[PDB]
Amino acid sequence: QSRSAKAGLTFPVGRVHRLLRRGNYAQRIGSGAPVYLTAVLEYLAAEILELAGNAARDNKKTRIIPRHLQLAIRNDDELNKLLGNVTIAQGGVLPNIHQNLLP
């Protein structure tokens, strides 16, 4: 049984440990670092998935359209502040209009 189950995760932690070990990071890798990484995955993916569902219910779609991804990104301040230049995969953009154009 993988040690993630007793820690509240699902990972085979040795997989991530090997990824770090072959990643040319350091000669000694802390055993708790991959576990903390797995927890980071769990919770960050939880909040991002709930953002995806947020934007999905914004259109009453049980599946996703990448417009949901764009809505989740741009409606969250930290995501937009972090990085926004590289392409959005079919998600489009949020065209912001001004109050001096339209009559």
Binding site: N85, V86, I97
Partner: protein, 82 residues
Amino acid sequence: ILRDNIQGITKPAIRRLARRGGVKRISGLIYEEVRAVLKSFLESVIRDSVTYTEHAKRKTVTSLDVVYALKRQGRTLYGFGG
């Protein structure tokens, strides 16, 4: 296919693209100058892409190739092969 296809991004296409920026009027010389800007950006990306393709002992260029080409631009957000 190989001769004077820079007009693929057409003047109505450029006008529609500028519609997404929130502009009411697009001047006549906007189209060709943004065409030149697009040409410059595309050339800059594809130079890195083809150099990586030559490095990888590959004849075909993949999407992940241009992903790495744009990687050193310095943002690297979501997308295919991220």
